[PDB]
Amino acid sequence: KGPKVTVKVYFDLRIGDEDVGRVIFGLFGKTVPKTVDNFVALATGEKGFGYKNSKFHRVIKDFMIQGGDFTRGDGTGGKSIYGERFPDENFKLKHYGPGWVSMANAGKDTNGSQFFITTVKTAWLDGKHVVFGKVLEGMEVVRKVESTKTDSRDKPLKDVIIADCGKIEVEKPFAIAKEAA
Amino acid sequence: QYERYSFRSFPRDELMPLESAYRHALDKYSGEHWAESVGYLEISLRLHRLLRDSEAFCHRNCSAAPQPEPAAGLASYPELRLFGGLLRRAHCLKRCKQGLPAFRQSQPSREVLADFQRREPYKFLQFAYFKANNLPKAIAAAHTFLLKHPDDEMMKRNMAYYKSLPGAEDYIKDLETKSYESLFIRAVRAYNGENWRTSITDMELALPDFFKAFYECLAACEGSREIKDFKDFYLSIADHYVEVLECKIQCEENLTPVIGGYPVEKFVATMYHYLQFAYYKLNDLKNAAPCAVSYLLFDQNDKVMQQNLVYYQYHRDTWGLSDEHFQPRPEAVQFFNVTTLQKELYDFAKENIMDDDEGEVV
Amino acid sequence: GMVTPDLLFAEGTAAYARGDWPGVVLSMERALRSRAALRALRLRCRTQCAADFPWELDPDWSPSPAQASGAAALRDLSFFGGLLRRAACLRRCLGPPAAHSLSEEMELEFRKRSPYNYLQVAYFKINKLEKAVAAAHTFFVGNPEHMEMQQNLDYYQTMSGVKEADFKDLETQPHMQEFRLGVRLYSEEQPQEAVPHLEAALQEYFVAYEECRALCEGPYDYDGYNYLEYNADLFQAITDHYIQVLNCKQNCVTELASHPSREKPFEDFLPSHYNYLQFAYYNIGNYTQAVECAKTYLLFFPNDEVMNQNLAYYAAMLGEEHTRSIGPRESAKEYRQRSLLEKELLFFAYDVFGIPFVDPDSWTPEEVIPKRLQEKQKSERETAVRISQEIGNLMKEIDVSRLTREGGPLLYEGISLTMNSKLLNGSQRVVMDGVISDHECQELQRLTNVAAYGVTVFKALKLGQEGKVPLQSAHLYYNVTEKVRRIMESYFRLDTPLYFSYSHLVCRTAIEEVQAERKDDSHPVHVDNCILNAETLVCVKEPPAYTFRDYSAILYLNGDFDGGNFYFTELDAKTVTAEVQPQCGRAVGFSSGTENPHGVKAVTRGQRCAIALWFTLDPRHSERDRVQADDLVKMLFSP
Ligand SMILES: *[C@@H]1O[C@H](CO)[C@@H](O)[C@H](O)[C@H]1NC(C)=O
Numbered sequence A: 001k002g003p004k005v006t007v008k009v010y011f012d013l014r015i016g017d018e019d020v021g022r023v024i025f026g027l028f029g030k031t032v033p034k035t036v037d038n039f040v041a042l043a044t045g046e047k048g049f050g051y052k053n054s055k056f057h058r059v060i061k062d063f064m065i066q067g068g069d070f071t072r073g074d075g076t077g078g079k080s081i082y083g084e085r086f087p088d089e090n091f092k093l094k095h096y097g098p099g100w101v102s103m104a105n106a107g108k109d110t111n112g113s114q115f116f117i118t119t120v121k122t123a124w125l126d127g128k129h130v131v132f133g134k135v136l137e138g139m140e141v142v143r144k145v146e147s148t149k150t151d152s153r154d155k156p157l158k159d160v161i162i163a164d165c166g167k168i169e170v171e172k173p174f175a176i177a178k179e180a181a
Numbered sequence B: 001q002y003e004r005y006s007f008r009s010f011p012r013d014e015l016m017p018l019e020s021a022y023r024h025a026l027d028k029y030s031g032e033h034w035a036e037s038v039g040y041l042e043i044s045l046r047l048h049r050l051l052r053d054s055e056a057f058c059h060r061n062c063s064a065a066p067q068p069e070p071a072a073g074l075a076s077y078p079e080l081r082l083f084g085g086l087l088r089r090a091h092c093l094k095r096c097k098q099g100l101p102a103f104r105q106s107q108p109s110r111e112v113l114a115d116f117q118r119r120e121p122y123k124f125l126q127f128a129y130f131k132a133n134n135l136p137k138a139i140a141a142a143h144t145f146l147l148k149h150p151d152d153e154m155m156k157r158n159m160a161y162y163k164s165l166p167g168a169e170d171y172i173k174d175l176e177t178k179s180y181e182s183l184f185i186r187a188v189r190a191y192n193g194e195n196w197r198t199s200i201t202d203m204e205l206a207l208p209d210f211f212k213a214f215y216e217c218l219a220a221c222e223g224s225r226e227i228k229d230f231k232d233f234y235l236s237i238a239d240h241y242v243e244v245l246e247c248k249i250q251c252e253e254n255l256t257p258v259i260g261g262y263p264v265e266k267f268v269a270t271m272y273h274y275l276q277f278a279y280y281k282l283n284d285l286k287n288a289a290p291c292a293v294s295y296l297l298f299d300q301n302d303k304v305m306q307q308n309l310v311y312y313q314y315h316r317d318t319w320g321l322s323d324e325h326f327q328p329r330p331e332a333v334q335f336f337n338v339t340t341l342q343k344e345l346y347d348f349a350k351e352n353i354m355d356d357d358e359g360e361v362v
Numbered sequence C: 001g002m003v004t005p006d007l008l009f010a011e012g013t014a015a016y017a018r019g020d021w022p023g024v025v026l027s028m029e030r031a032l033r034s035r036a037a038l039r040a041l042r043l044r045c046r047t048q049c050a051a052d053f054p055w056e057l058d059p060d061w062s063p064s065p066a067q068a069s070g071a072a073a074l075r076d077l078s079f080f081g082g083l084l085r086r087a088a089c090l091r092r093c094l095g096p097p098a099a100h101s102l103s104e105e106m107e108l109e110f111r112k113r114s115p116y117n118y119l120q121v122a123y124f125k126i127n128k129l130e131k132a133v134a135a136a137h138t139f140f141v142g143n144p145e146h147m148e149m150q151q152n153l154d155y156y157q158t159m160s161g162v163k164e165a166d167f168k169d170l171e172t173q174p175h176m177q178e179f180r181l182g183v184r185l186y187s188e189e190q191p192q193e194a195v196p197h198l199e200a201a202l203q204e205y206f207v208a209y210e211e212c213r214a215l216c217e218g219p220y221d222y223d224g225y226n227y228l229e230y231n232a233d234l235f236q237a238i239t240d241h242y243i244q245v246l247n248c249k250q251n252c253v254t255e256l257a258s259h260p261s262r263e264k265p266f267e268d269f270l271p272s273h274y275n276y277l278q279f280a281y282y283n284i285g286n287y288t289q290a291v292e293c294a295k296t297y298l299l300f301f302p303n304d305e306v307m308n309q310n311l312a313y314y315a316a317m318l319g320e321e322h323t324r325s326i327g328p329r330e331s332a333k334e335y336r337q338r339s340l341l342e343k344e345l346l347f348f349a350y351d352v353f354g355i356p357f358v359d360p361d362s363w364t365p366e367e368v369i370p371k372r373l374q375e376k377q378k379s380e381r382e383t384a385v386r387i388s389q390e391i392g393n394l395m396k397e398i399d400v401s402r403l404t405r406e407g408g409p410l411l412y413e414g415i416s417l418t419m420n421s422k423l424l425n426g427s428q429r430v431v432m433d434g435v436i437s438d439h440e441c442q443e444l445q446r447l448t449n450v451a452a453y454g455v456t457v458f459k460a461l462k463l464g465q466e467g468k469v470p471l472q473s474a475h476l477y478y479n480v481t482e483k484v485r486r487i488m489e490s491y492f493r494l495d496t497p498l499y500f501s502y503s504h505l506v507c508r509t510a511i512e513e514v515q516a517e518r519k520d521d522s523h524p525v526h527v528d529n530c531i532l533n534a535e536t537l538v539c540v541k542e543p544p545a546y547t548f549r550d551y552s553a554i555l556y557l558n559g560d561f562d563g564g565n566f567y568f569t570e571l572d573a574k575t576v577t578a579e580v581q582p583q584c585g586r587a588v589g590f591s592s593g594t595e596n597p598h599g600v601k602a603v604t605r606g607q608r609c610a611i612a613l614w615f616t617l618d619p620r621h622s623e624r625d626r627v628q629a630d631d632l633v634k635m636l637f638s639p
């Protein structure tokens, strides 16, 4: 069995001055609401502030590529639609492998607006972060952006910019296997 | 491994956590050392059996304990009565658990218990036995593993290899056995040996042990869970019990003996059928009628027993049989109630409480 | 669907920041309506199908004596079937479960009545001044220490267009409004207008109590990340959750009797209602109601002498048969009986499972407390008057605050005072040396080095049980924690007992590769009780900080390292007042209030290891992991 996807959002990545491709996320709206809604609202920019022209600030090799802040790029910023932070909802899904998205928090019940795309099976993060998505396509784009050169602070020397971000509606919730990729 | 085992007087030299002994056994197994691995695996099996026996003894009292009648003023508030009884039972369980030696160690995780309930250590046990000149023990362990898992390819291959070797053709013994299975085997053997009294005695002995084992296995399934959602009071205590019921349902079919590679269907009905026939052949109606009533209770759609019961009803006024001798046995009624209630409760629960947010991947 | 209050609140705050008054008023009003609608829905259907499915109970079913196991199984099955039916109904009603939960900050800003501040600003900017004065009065009633809103209220009162009767309160609950108004009328010697308001106050009090008891079945409260180590069975988790629910239900009597205009909940609310009622009824001339109210008051307090004189006087005035026929009121009897049963159950749970409980009622008879608990209350009452005598002897022979609340015996021998509070330039300060020897320091160092770096005492005991860390060190840690607790309690002349809040053994490692251009301080100067600021040098005792911590202590295990000092600072967070030098066995004990801002410097090459301890004076906020630590200690070493 598996969870049912409900909506899809696409990201356009630009490493420096070149384009790489498209990433299509699948978000579980029936298992984890109030988080998919936040991600979709930020992606489609109903209230103005959003992921448009954002940046990736952690490109840690072999581990993940974390980004999502849009107020300040140093990693001490970012806000949601529910004020500033909202509590963790439920840890029903685990980090089953590469390409599973989650919500980066700075403690307990401190969810903000920063996600991270996992690249290896990180089972020691279970029970601490909430998982709400899966990278359906464009895994090679994630592989290409993961390998960029970085200094000692994990920041990429060449900027990675989310050029565009939209939302694709799904007419039928279909299940996806709880596996890698 | 189970020859020198005693629940009461346990040797204190081998009292170590199950996980540590299993880890040591696995490490020695990977290191191409056989005798030490065999000893450590046997110790781990004994520790697991000790934990199960300690759980059964802890639930013997506490759970089956009468409650003194409360005051008159408390009778108007039922919720307080129910949850006060629950608190008393929980306190009794907490008091009883601390005294036993098996509960003062580090309790294993749920995955280790799941592995031990799948009889998986017997693979390493049989391999190490074969690599140490213990062929009868090797075939016994292979048969014990294959009884629980009759769909394994490699284990079937090693079983066929072992069977080909001369000599090891009569040592096929199941290492995880129960008393009621053996008693039933002797009862059936005597019944086929046209002997009635011995079969009657064996069946009447074997029924209470099966009931005791079934109730202990039911009581041993109310365990813990992994927390992954934070809901209200009723909605969160109605999911733990859904998992517990899922665990409880399989206990009837996990204790059914398997002979010839096929489990015996309708075990209790089979006992009552054999008992009824044995009593009939001795013309003991006074003890033969209730067996027929119980069998009709279990297998409602039957033909020969319905005609039997009709015939007994026709000649009721000749053997001096009253009207209350056509009632089912109390133990059969309890078994029937406690199985029907569980199945109906699971059917109800898997329509309204179980969340619908998962599908079949196609 | 009904959108959550926090989203509307955020939108309204953003609109207020941008400067769109219609937007902020619209969003704030929508949020205010939605919160009440959601609460009403929860209450309505929880009550409706808690009453739809009763608990039934089976007294006719007598369990079989011989077949105990089957009887137990059936008795469990019936109860769990009823539970499943109730849960199914609740799932059918409530629908989306994610709309009812919101963060703690949002509940805080709804308690402080900020949307009324925004609404009054917007309404003044829109020229709808009637709603403006209504919102301003509501906010001022909510927060009584606000000078600005007083100025706006005075301006509105002077400016023409506001009427005296338009000052309505839109947030205070009904049953409290007629109580205060009724008491004010009674104070002016007007008993004609006093009885109806007080009788109403009774009725809405009972209605509000019943409504508030039905909103307590909420989510279980785990201690941070302790739901990853929760290994309780079915019948233990059920009882833990129900004990928490019972505590929450019994805590409503102290919430129904509190107002923001006062700093302490009213004393004996319902008995005071009946006392005022019987006084007013005697004043009016109605005697039967006076006698009935006197009897239903004496039901609660049966040894009150003055009320007995009043009852005897009324009985003498009236006839004996009349004063014998009339009795108390039934609702008070039912209330008392249910509360007594709940208190009995909670006291049994406290006695057995060690789950703390503090009685919110002063009329509780001593017959409901177990004998084990009644001895612990006897000892703490003996030592409360013992301490008050010593302070009396100190003063009778005699800046007071530095002499009559410090200078304790320091029970354990081999312990001296390296610094007192005077040399340390401040109050509530001490530096003791030699609480433990070098063997203890080495053993704790090995314990923290083997496995690491905050490690609690419960986790250390668990690791010692598994076999990773030595058990003797895990017991020495527990013993030193208890010894330091007793030392801290004794030195500061505490009379009420000192409880445990948190404790973790930690180690700081100074990596020599990040030290370049590390001019910034390693840890900012702050305070433990409140949140120290950097502009107005004032802290707020607010929920995002820990407001229950009172005393703090630090115990050092080594002195082989450079830097990493401990210094006390003034409120300006700049002027260093006193510094201490870490060594072996040195303990720094200070009160965790706003008078002791502290800070730790930056460490260099070497190792720094210390135990940080925090204590509370509130039995409600205790270390919930210390009960299990004591349970483990009892069975491992004293079986
Ligand atoms: C259960 O424990 C109690 C100890 O209070 C003991 O008296 C009782 O015999 C035990 N139950 C059985 C069936 O032995």
Ligand SMILES: *[C@@H]1O[C@H](CO)[C@@H](O)[C@H](O)[C@H]1NC(C)=O
Binding pocket: B333, B334, B336, B337, B340
């Ligand atoms: C147990 O037996 C049957 C079960 O179908 C039914 O009569 C009932 O559930 C139980 N019997 C009694 C007398 O309650």
Ligand SMILES: *[C@@H]1O[C@H](CO)[C@@H](O)[C@H](O)[C@H]1NC(C)=O
Binding pocket: C286, C287, C289
């Ligand atoms: C006293 O009050 C009750 C109701 O409040 C009323 O029924 C009764 O008539 C009053 N007593 C007299 C003497 O009127």
Ligand SMILES: *[C@@H]1O[C@H](CO)[C@@H](O)[C@H](O)[C@H]1NC(C)=O
Binding pocket: C472, C475, C476, C479
């Ligand atoms: C800890 O204190 C207890 C006091 O009850 C004592 O019996 C025990 O020996 C002490 N253990 C250590 C390691 O100090």
Ligand SMILES: [Fe+3]
Binding pocket: C527, C528, C598
């Ligand atoms: Fe501090």
